[PDB]
């Protein structure tokens, strides 16, 4: 009937990740309670949608995956990408070595006229960190599961070759996906053959 596949895994920070959001110069988005760095699910969803739109090219498949509010063709979002929270194993590893979860990066901007360097501070998530990511795929149609999952594989490949937040053309936000499990939590659909990345 209706099925939901749970894709849990880890996002490993290859290079310092800055997703904007006391007084800190360009702070990163954090969990309000634990004050831990997070990767908002909206960020991942938007980045994968943009990468898949670049790849395919809105297109119908993007509407099936990330949902559409267009008049007439109201499409439900098949992908629910939850916020990626700072991993507990990464938390223990960073508590060891006396390493902070976030680093401060200092950058210059050399003017094209006066050759004067304006400094700028940003905050990033340290390269050793990992985030527990959780995604739910809704099987609204059984015939498009393979197409949806190959589109997700293409988006994940593009994301692994892209950044996730901040200015990644200047060496920020590189990430890697490790898929711990892909198991059908709702319904009878067989997701054993399915794979991402």
């Amino acid at each position: 009937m209706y099925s939901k596949i749970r894709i849990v895994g880890k996002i490993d920070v290859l290079t310092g990740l800055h997703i904007g959001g006391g007084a800190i110069a360009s702070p990163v988005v954090r969990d309000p309670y634990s004050r831990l760095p997070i990767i908002p699910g909206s960020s991942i969803k938007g980045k994968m949608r943009s990468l898949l739109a670049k790849h395919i090219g809105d297109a119908p498949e993007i509407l099936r995956l990330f949902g559409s509010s267009q008049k007439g063709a109201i499409q439900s979002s098949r992908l629910q990408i939850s916020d990626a929270f700072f991993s507990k194993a990464s938390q223990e590893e960073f508590d060891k070595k006396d390493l902070a979860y976030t680093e401060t990066k200092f950058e210059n901007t050399i003017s094209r006229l006066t050759a004067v360097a304006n400094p700028r501070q940003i905050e990033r998530v340290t390269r050793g960190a990992s985030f527990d990511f959780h995604i739910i795929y809704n099987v609204e149609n059984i015939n498009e599961v393979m197409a949806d999952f190959e589109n997700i594989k293409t988006a994940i490949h593009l994301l692994e070759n892209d950044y996730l937040g901040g200015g990644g053309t200047r060496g920020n936000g590189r990430i890697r996906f490790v898929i711990d499990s892909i198991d059908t939590v709702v319904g009878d659909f067989d997701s054993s053959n399915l794979s991402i990345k």
Partner: protein, 304 residues
């Protein structure tokens, strides 16, 4: 009719909206939960008869490490001889622990005790995450920021509610809640909010109170009676009318997204001397399907 306690522990922050995308409410009424349950039943192609005929549920109430919180009764409370501002404490009180519920009905809760109860709630932190929309940038435009008001619960806090019905209704609700863990409740479920895990069990601590008899009845859910019951159930009542609004979340209701008809329901905690049995009203305006608004009454009897 067997009462089942459903406890919901939330993984990600939740966006419970009142009127805006920036609103960060910590709870939802029985209307939102029942609409989510109906959507889940339609997704799983189950029958809607048990939900629409024999399920009585309460609002989503807070719970923390120490106690479960019930809505504050709208009872006439007496203060000290000259403590006029102390009444404001009872005005700011929203939830009372079950153990301290009866004491509140008997009038043995002072203003300082009410303030202690109000500050003793440890549900969580409400925040406002600022996001952006870069879709117009690719069309020679500008980014459009917006705000989502979320609420993150403390590690041992969450939202509980009580369900009443026969065995078949209870089991169907178990399947519906199991699917709702992964569907999510609230606002941006597809954008990383509302994910939770729920446990359904028996509630002796609540069966002690639900077996209590008294002279007054307290609403545990946002309810309203039909005209015939409203004729005689409104005498000596102390209630609070809430305007239930919103858009219809459905892919087949119409072409574009439209709002549903305005509804008005009594709040949780409203005290009546006559127990009225609500119903499931229709807030649909000539749509493809009938949009349901659950306003049945889950009652808690007490002595004033």
């Amino acid at each position: 009719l067997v009462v089942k306690l459903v406890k919901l522990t939330f993984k990600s922050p939740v966006h419970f909206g009142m009127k805006r995308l920036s609103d960060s409410n910590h709870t939802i009424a029985a209307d939102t939960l029942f609409s989510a349950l109906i959507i889940e039943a339609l997704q799983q192609q189950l029958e809607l008869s048990h939900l629409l005929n024999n399920l009585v549920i309460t609002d989503l109430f807070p719970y923390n490490k120490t106690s479960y919180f019930l809505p504050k009764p709208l009872i006439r409370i007496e203060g000290k001889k000259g403590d006029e501002s102390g009444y404001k404490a009872f005005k700011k009180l929203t939830y009372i622990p079950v153990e301290n519920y009866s004491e509140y009905l008997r009038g043995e809760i002072d203003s300082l005790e009410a303030s202690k109860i109000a500050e003793s709630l440890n549900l969580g932190k409400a925040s406002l995450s600022t996001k952006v929309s870069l879709q117009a940038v690719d069309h020679n435009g500008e980014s459009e920021p917006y705000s989502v008001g979320n609420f993150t619960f403390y590690p041992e806090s969450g939202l509980y509610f009580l369900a009443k019905g026969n065995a078949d209704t209870i089991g169907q609700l178990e399947i519906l809640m199991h699917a709702l863990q992964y569907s999510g409740i609230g606002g941006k479920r597809s954008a990383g909010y509302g994910q939770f895990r729920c446990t359904i069990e028996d509630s002796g601590k609540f069966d002690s109170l639900l077996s209590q008899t008294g002279n007054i009845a307290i609403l545990l859910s946002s309810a309203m009676a039909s005209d015939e019951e409203l004729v005689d159930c409104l005498e000596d009542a102390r209630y609070l009318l809430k305007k239930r609004t919103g858009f219809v979340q459905s892919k087949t209701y119409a072409d574009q997204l439209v709002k549903k008809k305005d509804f008005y329901a009594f709040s949780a905690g409203s005290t009546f001397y006559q127990k009225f049995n609500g119903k499931i009203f229709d807030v649909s305006d000539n749509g493809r399907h009938s949009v349901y608004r659950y306003a049945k009454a889950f009652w808690l009897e007490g002595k004033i």
